[PDB]
Paper text:
For ncMs 12 (6-((tert-butoxycarbonyl)amino)hexanoic acid (BocAhx)) and 13 ((S)-3-amino-3-(3-bromophenyl)propanoic acid (β3-mBrF)), we identified enriched and selective sequences, and found that the most selective hits converged on a distinct sequence pattern for each of these ncM. Notably, two PylRS variants, PylRS(13_1) and PylRS(13_2), identified by tRNA display selection, directed 13-dependent acylation of tRNACUAPyl, as judged by fluoro-tREX. To investigate the incorporation of the β-amino acids, α,α-disubstituted amino acids and β-hydroxy acids into proteins we added the orthogonal synthetase–orthogonal tRNA pairs for 13–20, the cognate ncMs, and [name](150TAG)His6 to cells. We observed ncM-dependent [name] production for 13, 15, 18 and 19, with isolated yields ranging from 3 to 35 mg per litre of culture, and mass spectrometry confirmed the incorporation of these β-amino acids and α,α-disubstituted amino acids in [name]. To further characterize the incorporation of 13 at position 150 of [name], we solved the structure of [name](150(S)β3mBrF)–His6 at 1.5 Å resolution by X-ray crystallography (the protein was purified from cells harbouring PylRS(13_1) and tRNACUAPyl). The electron density shows consecutive carbon atoms (C2 and C3) in the protein backbone at position 150; the meta-bromophenyl substituent is attached to C3 of the β-amino acid, and the stereochemistry at C3 corresponds to the expected (S) stereoisomer. Our structure confirms the site-specific incorporation of the expected (S)β3mBrF-monomer in the protein. The introduction of (S)β3mBrF leads to a notable kink in the beta strand of [name], when compared to the wild-type protein. Notably, the hydrogen bonding networks of the residues immediately preceding and following the β-amino acid in the polypeptide chain remain essentially unperturbed; this indicates that this beta strand can accommodate the β3-amino acid at this position.
Residue numbers in the entry: 4 to 64, 134 to 298
The structure:
């Protein structure tokens, strides 16, 4: 499905969440440019005040927009599953705190790439870095390690997110990921590699709702030319 990503593609993101019994919704819109590995989106909390820090939701809120270099084209599972798309499931374990469990469908709905997510959070501390809102409003560059899951005709990924904390410490979030195609058409099953990620978080001066503006660049790496 790599032909679907040669230009700029519109994106819609819909998240329904529950964290320690607090119900919230997020809606996002923007565009993806896989040629340059670039994502530009704005998210709104449509239920009022977001009950967790915006940075904790960034990984949950479309790896089909990653830039795969030409020599790594045969390792791009994410585009190969389009347009019917894939199911992306995670467990995110916040060190010394709670756990998110997520299930999303990523697929084309007409000409728009849509990411529809359900999130359940449990076992969070009221006084912790997440429900205490003690995380900095920023985002680090990460190491996303991908391996084939031959049995399920899909992939797994494993990686650590580093959330800077206002007291100068780091809140680790361990990510465990599975992706399975929605269609029965063939997909690419990759050799081991990683996605090199970078993001910045900002605000829109004319937006009164609780929101996050996101710019992200992602490139695949870890396989030698030849």
């Amino acid at each position: 499905g790599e032909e679907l990503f040669t230009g700029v593609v519109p994106i819609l993101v819909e998240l329904d969440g529950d964290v320690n019994g607090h119900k919230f919704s997020v809606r996002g819109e923007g565009e993806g440019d896989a040629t340059n590995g670039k994502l530009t989106l704005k998210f709104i909390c449509t239920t009022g005040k977001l009950p967790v820090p915006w940075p904790t939701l960034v990984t949950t809120l479309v790896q089909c927009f990653s830039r795969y270099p030409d020599h790594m084209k045969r390792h791009d599972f994410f585009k190969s599953a389009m347009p019917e798309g894939y199911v992306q499931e995670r467990t995110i374990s916040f060190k010394d705190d709670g756990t998110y469990k997520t299930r999303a469908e990523v697929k084309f709905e007409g000409d728009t790439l849509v990411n529809r997510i359900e999130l359940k959070g449990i076992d969070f501390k009221e006084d912790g870095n997440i429900l205490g809102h003690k995380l900095e409003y920023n985002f680090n560059s990460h190491x996303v390690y991908i391996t084939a899951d031959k049995q399920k005709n899909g992939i797994k990924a494993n990686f650590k997110i580093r959330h800077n904390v206002e007291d100068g410490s780091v809140q680790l979030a361990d990510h465990y990921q599975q992706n399975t195609p929605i269609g029965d058409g063939p997909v690419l099953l990759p050799d081991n590699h990683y996605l090199s990620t970078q993001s910045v978080l900002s605000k829109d001066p004319n937006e009164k709702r609780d929101h996050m503006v996101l710019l992200e660049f992602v490139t695949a790496a870890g396989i030698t030319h030849g």
